[PDB]
Amino acid sequence: TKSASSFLDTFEGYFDQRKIVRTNAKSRHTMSMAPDVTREEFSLVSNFFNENFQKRPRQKLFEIQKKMFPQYWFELTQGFSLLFYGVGSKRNFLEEFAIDYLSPKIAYSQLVNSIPCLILNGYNPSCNYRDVFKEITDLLVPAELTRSETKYWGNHVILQIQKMIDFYKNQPLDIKLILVVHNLDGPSIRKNTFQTMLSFLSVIRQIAIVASTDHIYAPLLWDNMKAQNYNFVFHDISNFEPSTVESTFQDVMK
Amino acid sequence: CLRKRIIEEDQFQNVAANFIHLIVQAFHSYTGNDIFALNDLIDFKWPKYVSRITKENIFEPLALYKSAIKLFLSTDDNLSDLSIISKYLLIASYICSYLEPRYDASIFSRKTRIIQGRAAYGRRKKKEVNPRYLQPSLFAIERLLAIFQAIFPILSALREESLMKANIEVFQNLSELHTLKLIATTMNKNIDYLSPKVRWKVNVPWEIIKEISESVHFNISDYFSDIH
Amino acid sequence: ADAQRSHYTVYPSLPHIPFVKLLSGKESEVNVEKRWELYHQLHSHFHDQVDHIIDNIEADLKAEISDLLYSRCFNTIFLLGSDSTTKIELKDESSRYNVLIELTPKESPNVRMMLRRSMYKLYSAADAENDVSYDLSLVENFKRLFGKDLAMVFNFKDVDSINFNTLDNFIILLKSAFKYDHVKISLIFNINTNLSNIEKNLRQSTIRLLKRNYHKLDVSSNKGFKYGNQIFQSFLDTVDGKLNLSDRFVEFILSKMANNTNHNLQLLTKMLDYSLMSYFFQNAFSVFIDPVNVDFLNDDYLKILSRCPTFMFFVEGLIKQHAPADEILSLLLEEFFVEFLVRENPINGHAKFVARFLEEELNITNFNLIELYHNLLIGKLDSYLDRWSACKEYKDRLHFEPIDTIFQELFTLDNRSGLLTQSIFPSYKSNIEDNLLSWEQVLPSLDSGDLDKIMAPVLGQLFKLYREANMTINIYDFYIAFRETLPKEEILNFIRKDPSNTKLLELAETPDAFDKVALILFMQAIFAFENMGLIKFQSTKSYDLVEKCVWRGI
Amino acid sequence: SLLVKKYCKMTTEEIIRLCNDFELPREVAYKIVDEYNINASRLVCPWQLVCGLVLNCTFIVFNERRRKDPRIDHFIVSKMCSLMLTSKVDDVIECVKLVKELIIGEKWFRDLQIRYDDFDGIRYDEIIFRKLGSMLQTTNILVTDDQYNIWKKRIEMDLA
Amino acid sequence: SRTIKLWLKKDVKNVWENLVQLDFFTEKSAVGLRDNATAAFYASNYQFQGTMIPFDLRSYQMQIILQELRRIIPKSNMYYSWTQL
């Protein structure tokens, strides 16, 4: 079904491809004419093609991308948050960078255990901001709010993070926590309170932020204040990876 | 102020009462029968009326009215910095909110065709209701970005591709416009920005977008003169 | 499994600077550490001045609000372009409580919550230096409880975000306190858009109430360019005598600084910082901004510095001016490199000179020092000074021609590679579209080699058919179009390459094998497109048609 | 002006005559023939498409000569205005940009880009590090080693 | 055409607010004053769409129709002829 349009790109292509199709010019082709495929053969063919089709170019490209790892480390030490984007899964890249590379480098440069890496699976729709902050408060042990700081039915998480920001401004600038956020534009983490929480955590220089995004409209999530607080350096890392872990929360039959 | 004016250069009560009836005769149609609004107008226009009292005017009420006639033709009860991308995004959102999406190729399409085809002909007959008198329509993100690209200002040009694409600055400006509520959504709390079900609409009147377009020297009225 | 969890902490297993070795890895580690420490002193010297400038912004801005706030109606202050981050101070004024109340739109869902939070904060602040009801009778009983007079200063934060009906009703509520002789009320409005947008949302009687005494205050950092010029001058005095700034870089700074208005200074700081990191990470000649490293000259330094176009122009001018060939071959250098890296480059001091002459000798304040520096770089300072109609008599004193010095290309901040664009302000959706459409600029073409050679990756192959289609796509026709591009024989040979997998070998000899494989790959790529936001199902319970959402080049 | 003439008549012999005056390889010339043939019923001016096709192929095939000599890039379009009977050069680069939309993503164009190792004017090993945002990417404010070597050999030739 | 001062939009805004306040106009599909305190508490924590759009675009309905105005407005009024269509 190639379009009979003169244009493909820009607003010219946008206005030229949104024309009106008559009823007799439409196709009444349905999913009932498709060959029937069960879940098991779907799983079998997908894990065969995701492990043997274009695996060697993906391997060589991934070996090119780890030459960027010292530059990523240098951008994290100067206070910038890393945002990775591209076509394909970036989950293995983020855990391999943060765990196998970045945490021993930060721990050895700050001279004995390595830096803890808190992983946020934003592709999970059950990612909850209060339990993430519970894990953060166990990892960092911040001072609790006094009675005048609780305000009047305020959000205790946001007030505690603001107190944390005012505390950590007069501390040595040594990274105490590595916050990895797979799929920062995921279904529950893209909400306003979660983004506000994560940007205010990104204000703190002692927390390293390594995040990834999958949606094409992800920079719509951040206004001027959130872009100032996040302090992103953007890095395009396209690899055409399968993304099989993130697909377990959706139904592939539909 | 009155006793400073009589030293700088029953009848005091006469001129105060005459000012009160002049205020009432000038502004009763505007204030209605409101005691409070007329009291504010009296308090606002009393010192400017005292400041135009002369020796020729103190015993001549009509000439003193004509000397300070500007205070009675206008009520004057009022209190009288966006980026270039934010300004053009506001203009494009107004265009998307008040032009129906089936004739944009009849206005914005300008580029040379290699493949045979026809653009939109345009609207056949004009409507007789000004659409800016009604509530704004809803649009998608990509229509707003397409019209914003259409209306944004423009051998080394071979590798130039002189058309501004929606980079992160455009999306950041759009998000700033949403958090200022110059753009609005269909839902207000727990907003899913990345859902295609969520649509956008302009949230400014015609006067605000008019002075915004004159701030950037954009002819926004030319897109509305032929339509109605 | 941790992959199926919401969140989990990994205590990595621990089995020293991020700077790498340049000169194709032949740089010494001493030079790497010296580059690291040199970058740290330059970064510290810039950021100490930046912190002092930001502190001075805070101090002077609190001073202006404190002046305007002091010396039977509201005392209204409108702070235009505020962004509501400043801590407002109130003095100690004996026999009178000065209580400051911050209200955000999140703390203001209705008038009742505004009053309850305001009176709780008022009672808490009065007690801090028998329970009561948190209502306006606390205001009328304030001198009976605490003995002193009351001065409330309300600070409404993000006034463009609070519901205006609630704010109007709250101002009308606070009007009731005017009948008490021991109460004065000041209101501070953090206006972000403009004042005309605010008064069109308030009722006319409220505007008439607010008109009795109000003061406007432009509190933006863009007003007068007074704070941006100090940051840019601090960066200039950091790099004075060490690094040059290109006209391309300053033009980029101006163009990006125009696109952001509420947050301008930290964008400028971020751009200058990232340029400094990029220079000290990519350039091995950075050690030569310190004169003590001139004994660290090696061969690879000489062949890198011999490709400078200023050196190219200098030696071709030398063969233009000198007839004998013996002196030319002697230069084609190590001693000639040293004697020119210690030049003063007085453009920074002259920029400071015209800045202080424009500010303190001609009483002209509305100039951008970044734009003035760009005009001094391109050589058109007179065309920048002929605007105010007062530099006509001083046109000849402030003349400066640019001196294109030798070997300045090894010590400069530029953008001719687009690295600052790709890292700070990328074309995000355009990069996604171009990686989907092309894909040979992402995946290498190594020369299952046959199927990798002649079949595209599935997402790019789907995007090639997606882009050429209409707004509304039939899913079955899309699958038919996708199946035609695939090789029917090489795919069936590819799934028979592994003899260990038996169920795939069993499915391979089915007469409906290739269509099943094509439909599985098509459905996986379609759900990848749906998760990326490229397509949308325009239904709930059919999933037979999709709508295109994203167009390349928009 | 050959770019103005609407619905004009042409054969494959004129296509081979145009593709042989630019010294393209023969397989690229027949792919240009096939690309015109699969669009031939739907062009308002087929010389626009043909001009863009030969110009986009001759940018790719001689990428090395254009890198070591930029004046070839100032020659080829300057020659082709002599063949399209146009005085201004803006319509030729407009043809290049308009045809570039229609052949990007096509399989044979991508294979040509791979086998000449030319992706929007540069090799793969540079474009991958500009896509990654590497600080160590080979920016062009100096000259290359090959340009420096041939310049040094030329200046040593003209010295004696 | 067949004199009366034509007032500007900014001045007519105050007359419009006074007509809303005197219950001549009513917001479209407005419930108004709730029956019990629980419904009023539920309404007070909701942000109505009419309170965020600009005032010139709010839908309103008449508490008095044009026929009733023709019934009550005396014949000697200078706007009586416009109480008919």
Residue numbers in the entry:
A (entry chain B): 233 to 343, 355 to 497
B (entry chain E): 214 to 222, 230 to 300, 323 to 396, 405 to 478
C (entry chain C): 16 to 30, 38 to 93, 100 to 157, 179 to 381, 388 to 502, 510 to 616
D (entry chain F): 271 to 430
E (entry chain D): 424 to 425, 447 to 529
Give the authors' words:
The coordinated action of multiple replicative helicase loading factors is needed for the licensing of replication origins prior to DNA replication. Binding of the Origin Recognition Complex (ORC) to DNA initiates the ATP-dependent recruitment of Cdc6, Cdt1 and Mcm2-7 loading, but the structural details for timely ATPase site regulation and for how loading can be impeded by inhibitory signals, such as cyclin-dependent kinase phosphorylation, are unknown. Apart from Cdt1 and Orc6 (a subunit of ORC), all loading factors belong to the superfamily of ATPases Associated with various cellular Activities (AAA+). Here, we report cryo-EM structures of ARS1-bound S. cerevisiae (Sc) ORC and of the ternary complex with Cdc6 at sub-3 Å resolutions.
